[PDB]
From a paper:
The membrane domain of the mycobacterial ATP synthase is embedded in the IPM, with the catalytic F1-domain of the enzyme extending into the bacterial cytoplasm and attached to the membrane domain by a central stalk and a peripheral stalk (PS). As do other ATP synthases in eubacteria, chloroplasts, and mitochondria, the enzyme couples a proton-motive force (pmf) across the IPM generated by respiration to the synthesis in the F1-domain of the enzyme of ATP from adenosine diphosphate (ADP) and phosphate by a mechanical rotary mechanism. The mycobacterial rotor consists of a membrane-bound ring of nine c-subunits, attached to an elongated central stalk, made of single copies of the γ- and ε-subunits. The mycobacterial PS is made of two proteins, bδ and b′.
The turning of the asymmetrical rotor brings about a series of conformational changes in the three catalytic sites, which lie at three of the six interfaces between α- and β-subunits, leading sequentially to the binding of the substrates ADP and phosphate, the formation of ATP, and finally the release of ATP. As in all other F-ATPases, the F1 catalytic domain has threefold pseudosymmetry with each catalytic interface of the α- and β-subunits separated by 120°. Each nucleotide binding site in the three α-subunits and in subunit βTP is occupied by an ATP molecule with an accompanying Mg2+ ion, while the site in subunit βDP has ADP and an accompanying Mg2+ ion. The sixth nucleotide binding site in subunit βE contains an ADP molecule with neither accompanying Mg2+ nor phosphate. Similar to the prior study, the electron density maps for each of states S1 to S3 has density for both tethered and untethered forms, and hence those particle classes contain enzymes that are auto-inhibited and others that are not inhibited by this mechanism. In the tethered forms the mycobacterial-specific extensions of the α-subunit make contact with the γ-subunit. In the untethered forms, these regions are disordered in the reconstructions and are presumably freely moving in the adjacent aqueous environment.
Author numbering:
A (entry chain G): 3 to 35, 85 to 94, 256 to 304
B (entry chain C): 29 to 514
C (entry chain F): 8 to 475
D (entry chain B): 29 to 406, 417 to 521
E (entry chain D): 358 to 475
F (entry chain E): 239 to 357
Write the structure that this text describes.
């Protein structure tokens, strides 16, 4: 279930990255021209910077998750082979 | 008598030549009082698992048949005793007067030798008794990561049977068997002390196969405990058996099977590990009235790693038992204790394992909490939710508070009925979330001090009469005036 | 009555004996390697009876240079090590040979390194706090005097430094005897420990047994038993309070796996020996207090490839009273000791043993850190700005708490030049009560890093610009 | 004499019947000068791992004893030579007149045969020599992704020993062994060329098991280099051994184990791959004075995949060595070279083996950089200082610095003398300035080198010289860097 | 369409499309909240939550697990009810009204018991 | 090699696809009953690749230069086959659909492509 979970996380992170990127570009448009995606502004330009940061973080997260997923993929192949060959060796 | 000879030996396994008439799973005597069991029988030799101290086994030693399949002594003398998987005392308190002997592999009751599970086995834990109720004859898996409270649930269930024991009525009494498999000796000693303080050793037996035991003893301990329980079950008694835990028994069986060089399966487990657990757990049953009406309730424990219930042994055992209480580290650390994951914990007997009052108050509690958790996740970043959504969230937070319970703090079934009634019938809504617990604690105390007839009515009739409901509602409303909501 | 080598497969040797003279399991046999540079006397340990009067044995020394057909002599007993007050202050190898004084101890009483664990009826659960002065240990993972403590961690997260810390905090003012087992760890770490103990005047109360990385798997599997035999003698015969330090017990399991492979056994999961749990259980159940006879054991458990689900540490968990799980993620943040407060545990962290206040404060710390962990997915993308005011407040509190669980350690001075600190348990409880209640929310986060008690907190907050 | 015969042969393994008197791990000669090591000895045959051209092995071939456990020739004649893991020359320069032979699997010095690491092993790399100092007898892991500069660090360290060599004092000289395991032949040739141009082959031996070699040679190469080095170390010499890289050796050993049908574990590695690396690296030690005080410093190289230091082999080696220099691909591609990562890079035991002047100038440097990284992730003055420090730690390949020059450069960075200088010129600035101090005021370097300390008078003169240099330093931008 | 007919098939496909879109949006709703969705996507999310709840049903064999007797909904009522749900005709009812009921009469009764009206 | 060593020519050796060479080696290893290594590849993966690649070299003033199509399983560059291959690669040329669709030939992606001697 580790690989299934990692794939689900990768899908979620991809959707988030797409949304944040669209928000960043729309905030760029609205700069030339309530909500909480403005970063530390409460604590358009600020939303643009916050969405840039968020989409970059989503990209970093996708890369890390993909690395972990590929490690799990390789480990699963190796383990499955180990079980198959262990059984075959037992019978041989 | 027929004699074979050891031809090779190591790591708790031996191979014996001769013994032409040995049976499958026969007990074998090695020199020095060491016993073994014949697992592999082929033309050349018998592969035997040593149940004890194999370092004394040598090539050329004489091995004798016993003519007996694996069996253990059984009787009422095992109550209050700690034994090893052969039924031999290890508590240093002398011999145990056995009533008789039982073969470990006697078959489970058939479809027509049973009747439906219909008697509650109260744990004293609100979350379990209201949301995953356990009946007599049920197998309820307690599964979770290390230190999530699995042993605490099982030991508190054992301790909650003291009142039933004191009644003296064998149709009410529950005798308890605690099988410790692969546990460190001091942990078993601490469990025994906990049982002793609560007066549970009067009706409890501990079958112990600590981590220092041979893999054979660890493999056998669940079956030994099951046979001891079955002797009572078939004599019209009610038995609760705890296996703490079956993960280690599966590992011990895998060790034995690999040492015998049987071909491994998934995770190197033998092909029949599912069978190992299923044939054990199907012996827990609710017997029909023709066979005495006895029962044995099973509480197997499974330890998962990294909250991975998809591993081989957890999946097997989940697919065997009549429901599971899933304990989570994240819930535990949040303060949800017992750390039951309500969405995925289920009882497959359901309301049949509850008294009428509990069934009525706790009707849809589990689905309500499941939907509450779903909504909580969905409404995490919602601003200005619906009125209905806000009401659902408030009620669910109150219910979650209501189901929190400290260790060694059992509630009688009537107290649980009243506690649940508070939440599900809406009487906690005026109470702040953070005070919910306190409120319940003080309300029950109040009903205990006065209006104790509400508890008496629930206890004696198993249902909350309309007039008792009216009185309880009035008592709650009166108590709320004097309650200080911090 | 002598046997002869018939097979050699690395550190495992098959030996034939005349019928009737086959040695017993665990007997020590002796063979000779005569090749000049590698000349030595091999100690073999009988591991299996193969049949036809053949035994399979594990060599305690490398077998390089051994020849088929050479004579093998059965000593008639298992490997035994010298015991008594004389072993204190001296360094030994897994066979009981003194390394700092060769020949020393040959005249002492010798005990077989193989024995049964204490009878179940002699076992007594231990619930008594061993106060360390480390904030995180005392608060969240209180150690047990006479109990079993483990330090889990991946490669280089601070296990050995924490073992040295606990030697400093527990062994130095100890009144009883100490036994240190180096199992499959760095030889220079052993030399460093020897020198450090001599400097601190603790060596005279300590027996050091080393079988380190550059040893055959048999020595790495038996050295722990040798050290444990010395500890058992001190516990049972001398009626002494004993400390037992082991670094690293995972190396014992790993050596067992190597040996099992050589012995021809079918592998279990992840290539481990089928008897992994059983070997570990024998060893661990020997390491224990009995009624009136106390051993406090501290063991470092290596976690392969940072995989806490690996079968070796996973099996080790059940044998412990207190478990400090070091985390790579904590280590990466500069938090020393790199304790994972949510994964560590103590069997005595419950109100009955430590009291209501300690338990409540520990539980509130754990709740806050758990909530912070649950928010990490959201924070990793958006930061704290999207959180609700309650969650923002909790996150600030949790960051300060997780910093304040760090501590300048005594053994860390060699790395940072900063002397360590000791915090009384009462002060730790009070300080974390204030922290969870939000009384230090105004102080900057860095003020909570690598300090001791509240006085240090005030001084560092001042040095930064705030004021407590 | 005893003559065995090949009964079967496959995939670098052979089985030989006969040779009743063969020893475990003995070297066996197969026809055509092929060698094998007797791994498994039973009553039917000897399993042998072929070290060399396995394709020449045939059934029925005669096999002869060597009478020698697995061993290599050792002696001073190996300096400046390139050999294979058997000690046979491959540089085409004739025979190597060996002093003696040394068995490959001799045990490491015991806990009581060592002493604390206390003498620095200067790498000439400012980042390492300042932040992860290496003492003689220490094992420092060089770990990183492919093409992150690992070989460059190790080769620069070897090149840095030329000045020590020229003194002729065996207490100061460092003899170098460079083991190439599974490396492309062209890269070994380039390494040898760089060592020759730097005058380093005089005191360096190369053990080569290139990518085209069979697994037996790749598995053996580190032990051969270690034995060559140990011969010198036990004779009171100081040795530096580079294993480039141990990932490939682990792969070779895994191949050999699988071909022997040993059941694997994690990542299909044999259960004793940890032992493979740990017994190798345990033999790098700082000997006690009773044993001569010699030392062997190990620089194992590990290649990670995608910067994953939590994998099995990297964690094994991390748990063997006394610290690691983590080379980050992100830094390398940003032009930060050598691409050392401060957060993960640490010297466990080299803190003591650092001259006093370097300690004084670098103790702050460590903290400044560690905190500047987190700040830059997101004061302004500390940002400028951190940029200047990151610039200062950059270093061209093949140009190690003497410790006195490193002290002066770290002084410049740490004492704020670069706050005035443009970032883009810091490098050039430092270079020219150091050259100035060599041409004139060279007594500063002499004082530091003799005393190993930075004196108050020498520090004052250094500041004066820095100001005079700033007077006439032409920034690329054109602006003066004065004050 | 050839077997179940055009109405059944179209309603089924619309339900599936809505639930698929909701599953696509769940991660965004979890991280960034629902207010960041488009108004049309918010409409779809409300419809989808009601639809998924209305696919649940009180089954007879589940009485023992809920205390509630089961219900049976004719095919025609199912098709008409889900056609209405996909069109947004019940968006004014709380989502909890759709949980563990039978047909539209049960829906009206449960909504009344929760305050709203069908 | 004959062209380089006997005819004294410079040779361009194209290999499409080198991954299929690695995989054929894995299949042969399986057929011969060898225990698979990590991710199921032959235990001698690196040795086989080295034996092939180290013959592609410059020597005696003439060279064999190789352009090799590489398939990356699962797009995972840490997969043993692409990792072993890239241990020998000196440059990468990525042809981009985007660049081709602009009429730019050769359709080399100037940002994705790289070389180890551009220093
Ligand atoms: N309801 C509870 N409230 C508070 N603490 C509890 C509760 N239940 C259990 N605990 C504590 O949680 C810790 C773990 O409990 P327990 O030993 O029963 O768990 P486990 O899953 O069986 O553990 P192990 O992995 O050691 O076998 C113990 O300290 C116990 O006191
Ligand atoms: N308290 C501390 N303060 C500062 N640095 C520390 C501290 N603890 C550990 N370190 C750093 O971490 C390094 C590793 O510590 P330690 O040797 O205890 O790790 P380990 O877990 O035993 O490692 P291994 O798996 O390699 O044996 C130490 O050399 C030191 O650099
Ligand atoms: N200090 C440096 N300054 C500038 N360029 C450098 C430096 N070190 C290395 N390089 C460049 O980086 C290239 C790769 O470095 P190097 O070969 O040392 O890395 P590696 O990690 O050992 O590589 P591989 O994976 O090929 O073995 C070198 O060819 C050189 O071009
Ligand atoms: Mg438990
Ligand atoms: Mg360590
Ligand atoms: Mg390189």
């Amino acid at each position: 279930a580790t690989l299934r979970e990692l794939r689900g996380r990768i899908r979620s992170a991809g959707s988030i990255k797409k949304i944040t990127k669209a928000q960043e570009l729309i905030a760029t448009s609205r700069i030339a021209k309530d909500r909480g995606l403005c970063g530390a502004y409460n604590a358009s330009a600020s939303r643009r910077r916050a969405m840039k940061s968020a989409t970059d973080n989503a990209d970093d997260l996708i890369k890390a998750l993909t690395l972990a997923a590929n490690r799990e993929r390789q480990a699963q192949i190796t383990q499955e082979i180990s079980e198959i060959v262990g059984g075959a060796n037992a019978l041989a | 008598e027929e004699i074979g000879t050891v031809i090779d030996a190591g790591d708790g396994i031996a191979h014996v030549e001769g013994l032409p008439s040995v049976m499958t799973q026969e007990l074998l005597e090695f020199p020095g009082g060491v016993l073994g069991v014949a697992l592999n029988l082929d033309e050349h030799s018998v592969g035997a698992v040593i149940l004890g101290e194999f370092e004394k086994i040598e090539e050329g030693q004489q091995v004798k048949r016993t003519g007996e399949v694996l069996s253990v002594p059984v009787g009422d003398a095992f109550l209050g005793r700690v034994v090893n998987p052969l039924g031999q005392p290890i508590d240093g308190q002398g011999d145990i007067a056995a009533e008789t002997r039982r073969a470990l592999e006697l078959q489970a009751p058939s479809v027509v030798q049973r009747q439906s599970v219909s008697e509650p086995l109260q744990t004293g834990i609100k979350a379990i008794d209201a949301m995953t109720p356990i009946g007599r004859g049920q197998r309820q898996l307690i599964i979770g990561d290390r230190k999530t409270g699995k042993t605490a649930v099982c030991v508190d269930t054992i301790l909650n049977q003291r009142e039933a024991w004191l009644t003296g009525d064998p149709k009410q009494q529950v005798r308890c068997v605690y099988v410790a498999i692969g546990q460190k000796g001091t942990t078993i000693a601490s469990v025994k002390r906990a049982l002793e303080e609560g007066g549970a050793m009067e009706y409890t037996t501990i079958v112990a196969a600590p981590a220092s035991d041979a893999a054979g003893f660890k493999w056998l301990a669940p079956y030994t405990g099951s046979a001891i329980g079955q002797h009572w079950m078939y004599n019209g008694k009610h038995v609760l058996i705890v296996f703490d835990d079956l993960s280690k028994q599966a590992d011990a069986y895998r060790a034995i099977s690999l040492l015998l060089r049987r071909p491994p399966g998934r995770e190197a487990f033998p092909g029949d590990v599912f069978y190992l657990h299923s044939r054990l757990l199907e012996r827990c049953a609710k017997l029909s009235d023709e066979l005495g009406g006895g029962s044995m309730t099973g509480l197997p424990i499974i330890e998962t790693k990294a909250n991975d219930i998809s591993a081989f042994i957890p999946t097997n055992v989940i697919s065997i038992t009549d429901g599971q209480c899933f304990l989570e580290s994240d819930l535990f650390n949040q303060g949800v204790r017992p750390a039951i994951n309500v969405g995925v914990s289920v009882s497959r007997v359901g309301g049949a394992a509850q008294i009428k009052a509990m069934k009525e108050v706790a009707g849809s509690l589990r689905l309500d909490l499941s939907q509450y958790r779903e909504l909580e996740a969905f409404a995490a970043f919602a601003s200005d939710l619906d009125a209905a959504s806000k009401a659902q969230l408030d009620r669910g937070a109150r219910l979650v508070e209501l189901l929190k319970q400290p260790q060694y703090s059992p509630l009688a079934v009537e107290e649980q009925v009243v506690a649940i009634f508070l939440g599900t019938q809406g009487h906690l809504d005026s109470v702040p979330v953070e005070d919910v617990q306190r409120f319940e604690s003080e309300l029950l105390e109040h009903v205990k001090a006065s209006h104790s007839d509400i508890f008496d009515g629930i206890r004696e009739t198993k249902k909350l009469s309309e007039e008792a409901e009216e009185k309880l509602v009035s008592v709650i409303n009166e108590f709320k005036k004097g309650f200080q909501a911090s | 009555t002598a046997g002869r080598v018939v097979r050699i497969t690395g550190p495992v040797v098959d030996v034939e004996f005349p019928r009737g003279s086959v040695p017993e399991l665990f007997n020590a046999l002796h063979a000779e390697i005569t090749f000049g540079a590698l000349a030595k006397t091999l100690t073999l340990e009988v591991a299996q009876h193969l049949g036809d009067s053949l035994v399979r044995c594990i060599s305690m020394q490398p077998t390089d240079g051994l020849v088929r057909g050479v004579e093998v002599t059965d000593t008639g007993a298992s490997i035994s090590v010298p015991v008594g007050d004389g072993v204190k202050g001296h360094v030994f190898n897994a066979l009981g040979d003194c390394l700092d004084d060769p020949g020393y101890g040959k005249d002492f009483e010798h005990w077989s390194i193989h024995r049964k664990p204490p009878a179940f009826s002699d076992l007594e659960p231990r619930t008594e706090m061993l106060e360390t002065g480390l904030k995180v240990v005392d608060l969240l993972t209180p150690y047990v005097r006479g109990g079993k403590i483990a330090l889990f961690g991946g490669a280089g997260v601070g296990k050995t430094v924490l073992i040295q810390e606990m030697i400093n905090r527990i062994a130095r003012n100890f009144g009883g005897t100490s036994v240190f087992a180096g199992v499959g760890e760095r030889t220079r770490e052993g030399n460093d420990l020897w020198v450090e103990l001599a400097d601190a005047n603790v060596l005279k109360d300590t027996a050091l047994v080393f079988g380190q990385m550059d040893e055959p798997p048999g020595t790495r599997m038996r050295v722990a038993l040798s050290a444990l035999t010395m500890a058992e003698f001190f516990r049972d015969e001398q009626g002494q309070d004993v400390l037992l330090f082991i670094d690293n017990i995972f190396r014992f399991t790993q050596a067992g796996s190597e040996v099992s492979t050589l012995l021809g056994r079918m592998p279990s999961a992840v290539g481990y020996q089928p008897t992994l749990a059983d070997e570990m259980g024998e060893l661990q159940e020997r390491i224990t207090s009995t009624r009136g006879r106390s051993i406090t054991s501290m063991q470092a458990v290596y976690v392969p490839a940072d995989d806490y689900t690996d079968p070796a540490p996973a099996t080790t968990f059940a044998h412990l009273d207190a478990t400090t799980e070091l985390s790579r993620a904590v280590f990466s943040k500069g938090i020393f000791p790199a304790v994972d407060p949510l994964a560590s545990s103590s069997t005595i962290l419950d109100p009955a043993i430590v009291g209501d206040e300690h338990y409540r404060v520990a539980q509130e710390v754990i709740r806050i850190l758990q909530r912070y962990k649950d928010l990490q997915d959201i924070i990793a993308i958006l930061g704290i700005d999207e959180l609700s005011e309650e969650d923002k407040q909790l996150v600030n509190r949790a960051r300060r708490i997780e910093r304040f669980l760090s501590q300048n350690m005594m053994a860390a001075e060699q790395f940072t030049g900063q002397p360590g600190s000791t915090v009384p348990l009462k002060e730790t409880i009070e300080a974390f009560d204030k922290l969870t209640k939000g009384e230090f929310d105004h102080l900057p986060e860095q003020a909570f890093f690598l300090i001791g008690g509240l006085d240090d907190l005030a001084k560092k907050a001042e040095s930064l610009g705030a004021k407590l």
